[PDB]
Amino acid sequence: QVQLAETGGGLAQPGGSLRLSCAASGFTFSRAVMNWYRQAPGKERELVARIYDAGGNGSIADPVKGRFTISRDNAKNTVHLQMNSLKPEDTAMYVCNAGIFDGNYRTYWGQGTQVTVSS
């Protein structure tokens, strides 16, 4: 019963910060690459960040390099997305995703959390 609960979006001022959370359950967390995606209204769903080894910095997509960072806590089966220096262009529906390698390749999405940046 794979579940991906997201928490911590909402409104933010330009230049502010947010720390999204994705808590996972139902699979072996060590066999999963954890990702954050986002989809602005009318645009396509694009990758934001991606991490597997909790000891490193993962991978950050170009439109948020130097502003967003991602972290992972293997004890609690969570990943956090530290969103800094926010811009109105970052407004979108953010959703985390697990890529699970386990005989088959499966991937699951969460319900998503809205992020709106505006004065």
Binding site: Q3, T7, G8, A12, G16, R19, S71, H80, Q82
Partner: protein, 280 residues
């Protein structure tokens, strides 16, 4: 000795505690007006703003692997259980950032929304109470009797239920598992909320039993649309009606206390974290 990140963390944490004091005072009133929900929302927004900057600063200390000495690590054991706090400096700073951000989103703000939703319901119900006097007029044949516009009152109460049938106590957005909904049900109060299926998920809806009881009471008064009540039958009805109103007042008071007490647990964490920064 000073480090810019630690300086700003100490100032930011201090501002959170200052906002916490103002919120405790606002929740220490006796009647939440619509200005009250505006004040709460202001303080909650300011808390979130400072919590989010604290997370950014703690995040810097994590990625730069700033040392947390053995003393600072002992103060952290004073953290409240709700924060869920030999591991590396990088990992501990990150768990502190997660802790303060998560206790705000998954705990403090859950009580906040439960208060805001129920408060709005009771305020809309109070709008019905304001119109009750105009639905009561003397009975034509006896000065000790009254005529009650049962259908007019019934109509308003049915629309009150419709207006909040889709505004749950928890969660503010999306849905949760049935198990998660039942956790917060037993926490908030089984007579204050009710678990409901939204669309494969679950929410903790506002328990509108008092309105339902009012409606069953109205129906038992007799038909026609209007009803004439002698003084006795009126006192009996109004007694039960006033009891339901006080039940809702008490339910609101229960959610405000839980919210207020959760803010104190949050305040305890900030207090502990600030002591930790002063020793780093």
């Amino acid at each position: 000795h000073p480090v810019s990140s630690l300086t700003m963390l100490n100032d930011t944490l201090h501002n959170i505690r200052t906002t916490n004091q103002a919120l405790k005072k606002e929740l220490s009133q006796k009647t939440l007006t619509k200005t009250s929900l505006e004040e709460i929302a202001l303080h909650s927004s300011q808390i979130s703003m400072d919590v989010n900057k604290s997370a950014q600063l703690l995040d810097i200390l994590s990625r730069n692997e700033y040392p947390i000495n053995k003393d600072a690590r002992e103060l952290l054991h004073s953290a409240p259980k709700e924060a869920e706090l030999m591991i590396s400096h990088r990992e501990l700073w990150a768990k502190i950032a997660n802790s303060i951000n998560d206790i705000n989103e998954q705990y403090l703000k859950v009580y906040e929304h439960a208060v805001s939703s129920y408060t709005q319901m009771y305020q809309d119900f109070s709008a019905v109470l304001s119109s009750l006097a105009g639905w009561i007029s003397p009975g034509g044949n006896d000065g000790n009797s009254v005529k009650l516009q049962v259908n007019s009152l019934k109509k308003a109460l049915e629309e009150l239920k419709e207006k909040y049938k889709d505004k749950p106590l928890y969660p503010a957005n999306n849905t949760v598992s049935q198990e998660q909904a039942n956790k917060w049900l037993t926490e908030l109060g089984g007579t204050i909320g009710k678990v409901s299926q939204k669309n494969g998920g679950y929410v903790v809806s506002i328990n509108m039993t008092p309105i339902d009881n009012m409606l069953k009471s109205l129906d038992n008064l007799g038909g026609n649309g209007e009803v004439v009540l002698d003084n006795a039958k009126y006192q009996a009805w109004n007694a039960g009606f006033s009891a339901e109103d006080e039940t809702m007042k008490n339910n609101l008071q229960t959610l405000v206390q839980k919210y207020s007490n959760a803010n104190s647990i949050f305040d305890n964490l900030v207090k502990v974290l600030s002591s930790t920064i002063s020793s780093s």
